[PDB]
Amino acid sequence: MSDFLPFSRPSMGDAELAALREVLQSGWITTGPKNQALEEAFCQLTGNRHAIAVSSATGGMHVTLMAMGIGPGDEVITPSQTWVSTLNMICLLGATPVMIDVDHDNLMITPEAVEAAITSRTKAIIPVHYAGAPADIDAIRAVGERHGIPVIEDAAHAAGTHYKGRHVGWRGTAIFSFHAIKNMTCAEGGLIVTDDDELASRIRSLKFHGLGVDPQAEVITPGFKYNLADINAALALVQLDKLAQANQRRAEIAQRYLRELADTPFKPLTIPAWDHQHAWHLFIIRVDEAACGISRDVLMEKLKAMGIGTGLHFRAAHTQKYYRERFPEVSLPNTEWNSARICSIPLFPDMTDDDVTRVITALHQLS
Amino acid sequence: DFLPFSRPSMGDAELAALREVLQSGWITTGPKNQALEEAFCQLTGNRHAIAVSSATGGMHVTLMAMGIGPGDEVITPSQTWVSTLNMICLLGATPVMIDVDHDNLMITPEAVEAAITSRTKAIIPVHYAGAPADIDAIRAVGERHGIPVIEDAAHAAGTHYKGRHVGWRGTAIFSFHAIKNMTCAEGGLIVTDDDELASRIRSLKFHGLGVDPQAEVITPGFKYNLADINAALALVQLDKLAQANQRRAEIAQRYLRELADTPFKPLTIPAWDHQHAWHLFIIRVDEAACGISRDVLMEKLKAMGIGTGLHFRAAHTQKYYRERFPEVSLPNTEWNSARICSIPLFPDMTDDDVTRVITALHQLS
Ligand SMILES: *Cc1c(COP(=O)(O)O)cnc(C)c1O
Numbered sequence: 001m002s003d004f005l006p007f008s009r010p011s012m013g014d015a016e017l018a019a020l021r022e023v024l025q026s027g028w029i030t031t032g033p034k035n036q037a038l039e040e041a042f043c044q045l046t047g048n049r050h051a052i053a054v055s056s057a058t059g060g061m062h063v064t065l066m067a068m069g070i071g072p073g074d075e076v077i078t079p080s081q082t083w084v085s086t087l088n089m090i091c092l093l094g095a096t097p098v099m100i101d102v103d104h105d106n107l108m109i110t111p112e113a114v115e116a117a118i119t120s121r122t123k124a125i126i127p128v129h130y131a132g133a134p135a136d137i138d139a140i141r142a143v144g145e146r147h148g149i150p151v152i153e154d155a156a157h158a159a160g161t162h163y164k165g166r167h168v169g170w171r172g173t174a175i176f177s178f179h180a181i182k183n184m185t186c187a188e189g190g191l192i193v194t195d196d197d198e199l200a201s202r203i204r205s206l207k208f209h210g211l212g213v214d215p216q217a218e219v220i221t222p223g224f225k226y227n228l229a230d231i232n233a234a235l236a237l238v239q240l241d242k243l244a245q246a247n248q249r250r251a252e253i254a255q256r257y258l259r260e261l262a263d264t265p266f267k268p269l270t271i272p273a274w275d276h277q278h279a280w281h282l283f284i285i286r287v288d289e290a291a292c293g294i295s296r297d298v299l300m301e302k303l304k305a306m307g308i309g310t311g312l313h314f315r316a317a318h319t320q321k322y323y324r325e326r327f328p329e330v331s332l333p334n335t336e337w338n339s340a341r342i343c344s345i346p347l348f349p350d351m352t353d354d355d356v357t358r359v360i361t362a363l364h365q366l367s
Numbered sequence: 368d369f370l371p372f373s374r375p376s377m378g379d380a381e382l383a384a385l386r387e388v389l390q391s392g393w394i395t396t397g398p399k400n401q402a403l404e405e406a407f408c409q410l411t412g413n414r415h416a417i418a419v420s421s422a423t424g425g426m427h428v429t430l431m432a433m434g435i436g437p438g439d440e441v442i443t444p445s446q447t448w449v450s451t452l453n454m455i456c457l458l459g460a461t462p463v464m465i466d467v468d469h470d471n472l473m474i475t476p477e478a479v480e481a482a483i484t485s486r487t488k489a490i491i492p493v494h495y496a497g498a499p500a501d502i503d504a505i506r507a508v509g510e511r512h513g514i515p516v517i518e519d520a521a522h523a524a525g526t527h528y529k530g531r532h533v534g535w536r537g538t539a540i541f542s543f544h545a546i547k548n549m550t551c552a553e554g555g556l557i558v559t560d561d562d563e564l565a566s567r568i569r570s571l572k573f574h575g576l577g578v579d580p581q582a583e584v585i586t587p588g589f590k591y592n593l594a595d596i597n598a599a600l601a602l603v604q605l606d607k608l609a610q611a612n613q614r615r616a617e618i619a620q621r622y623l624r625e626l627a628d629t630p631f632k633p634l635t636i637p638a639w640d641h642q643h644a645w646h647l648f649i650i651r652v653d654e655a656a657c658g659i660s661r662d663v664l665m666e667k668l669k670a671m672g673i674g675t676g677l678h679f680r681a682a683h684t685q686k687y688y689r690e691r692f693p694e695v696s697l698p699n700t701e702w703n704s705a706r707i708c709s710i711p712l713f714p715d716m717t718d719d720d721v722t723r724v725i726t727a728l729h730q731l732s
């Protein structure tokens with residue numbers, strides 16, 4: 001399978017291996033100075049005040065919602081059109097996810113859909129910056145502010161995303177991911193930025209056993225273990241140093257897909273009208289059987305037979321067994337239409353121009 | 368020139384394993400995880416091995432997979448790391464803290480039996496400092512009452528009990544944290560002989576995904592999977608474990624011999640047949656006997672360039688547990704928790720490093 005083109009691969013090379021050598025030689029391999037440097041780097045990148053490195057964005061979401069006091073009786077507004085981690089963490093704190101629909105062409109929640117779903121129980125709103133584009137975060141924030149409801153941003157796809165001239169997470173609270181397919185990776189990892197001093201203090205304690213000072217450190221309240229090792233933080237620092245060039249190459253690839261699929265029936269997501277810089281984490285197409293003459297599932301299967309990988313980001317959460325059975329009344333037409341028709345085609349900066357031509361040619365052949 | 372109480376043994380073999388993973392492009396959970404799990408089944412003899420992001424997370428998902436929650440009691444020492452107590456509480460269950468033997472810091476079958484109620488749903492013995500608890504006797508109490516025994520084997524990679532590796536049967540959780548005898552900086556691994564428990568754990572450490580067709584959320588789960596970068600490090604460290612533990616044993620034997628004529632008191636070696644992994648070398652520091660307190664000894668050792676650790680400040684004496692469970696009174700735990708410290712023990716210590724520690728302790732007596 002040496003000729004298989006996956007939909008993503010990391011850009012790991014000599015720089016990463018040299019950073020690893022440095023940490024190994026130091027003998028300080030779990031959380032330490034590389035974590036501190038990564039956190040400082042994300043404060044400089046975003047402009048926000050506090051950065052907390054964690055073992056995954058999922059764990060980051062877990063401890064952020066926990067630190068806010070989210071629990072039984074509370075509602076959290078979220079798309080269904082996202083990764084299931086967020087819905088799972090809401091449920092596992094005992095709270096209730098309130099799933100709302102998304103815009104049919106950029107797959108992100110709207111301020112109107114948020115406002116319609118607010119109740120006296122709502123304790124957080126979690127927009128997703130999808131595929132590398134930002135949600136209309138000022139408008140969503142304005143809805144939250146009017147009701148006194150915090151907005152927690154799922155920025156997994158948004159390392160390098162700008163919104164109205166600032167990096168995502170420049171204010172408010174946002175959670176980044178360093179999973180293997182993310183634009184910067186340390187295999188598994190994540191990072192929370194926030195402007196809220198008390199929230200940051202609670203998060204730092206709750207990702208490391210609830211330890212704090214009452215004197216020596218001791219458990220103040222039970223917490224979890226979601227700290228990031230320095231081996232991983234060192235990889236993340238290298239990948240952050242590479243991120244601008246990685247995203248530039250991703251944008252060049254995505255622009256070519258936009259142009260050369262314009263005269264095919266496959267339908268990319270639409271670029272938001274608000275000012276932004278897209279990180280191009282994923283290149284998603286909608287495959288409508290009536291327009292394309294091929295279904296999404298069959299397209300993925302035939303691409304695979306041609307040696308071309310694809311991903312499904314995402315099967316809507318409310319269509320999956322647990323949520324389907326717990327929340328059977330949830331009906332989200334834009335989500336359901338897209339979830340059945342989307343796939344992610346290869347997009348990663350180590351792709352060659354000929355890799356891109358191979359994908360485009362296969363899509364023209366399969367139309 | 369500082370001699371810490373622990374340092375990992377990382378070199379070219381670890382760097383070469385990392386190189387291989389990076390070159391493959393498959394950096395999170397994958398074939399190295401599979402190989403690590405198979406290697407732990409070969410090491411222990413047990414059937415299922417599930418690699419996880421930390422032993423804490425492993426404890427979280429193991430108790431969750433057993434159905435532990437509100438209304439359930441879990442018997443545990445207070446004399447352990449706070450992670451276990453925290454995970455019990457954060458599942459909504461109730462920790463029932465019991466005392467430990469005053470000289471090896473492990474729970475006894477009698478103490479377990481005395482704490483059992485109709486609400487008890489698990490017993491969690493700790494294999495402490497590299498020695499095994501009397502696990503057959505504790506298991507027998509559990510079996511008589513129908514209560515599962517989940518073993519905290521963080522300290523016990525390489526520990527044998529009656530000729531088998533810890534975790535050869537039953538359920539046990541290992542840690543690969545930086546100070547453990549084999550490390551991948553952070554990581555852990557669950558072994559179990561229970562097919563259904565293993566199936567649930569595997570799903571619950573990766574988002575609750577399972578097959579009802581394609582995988583989907585069957586019930587919400589957590590994210591505690593181990594990356595292949597880390598699994599590859601764990602494999603190298605497992606290949607080194609026997610030699611690492613042999614060197615630890617040589618150092619520990621020299622401490623036992625050359626501290627015999629000091630008032631510092633090591634833990635006692637259990638009477639049941641075992642092989643000690645020598646994760647920690649713990650001494651008790653009684654001011655009446657030693658002329659110096661535990662805290663002052665740690666401070667003066669640090670001033671001499673010698674690090675020490677405290678494994679552990681008993682959980683029930685820490686703010687949350689002291690205020691939530693003020694009634695807990697555990698005399699052997701309290702006596703030892705105020706008097707123990709861990710002196711340097713790791714396989715990269717040279718003979719001169721060990722002599723430095725012994726010399727300082729004789730000087731400070
Ligand atoms: C995968 C992902 C997450 C979780 O990130 P991890 O770092 O893998 O835990 C959260 N939100 C979205 C939208 C994701 O794609």
Ligand SMILES: *Cc1c(COP(=O)(O)O)cnc(C)c1O
Nearest residue numbers: 421422423448450519521542544
């Ligand atoms: C530290 C430790 C744990 C937890 O292990 P992690 O890998 O750090 O999560 C559990 N039990 C004992 C006895 C420990 O020392």
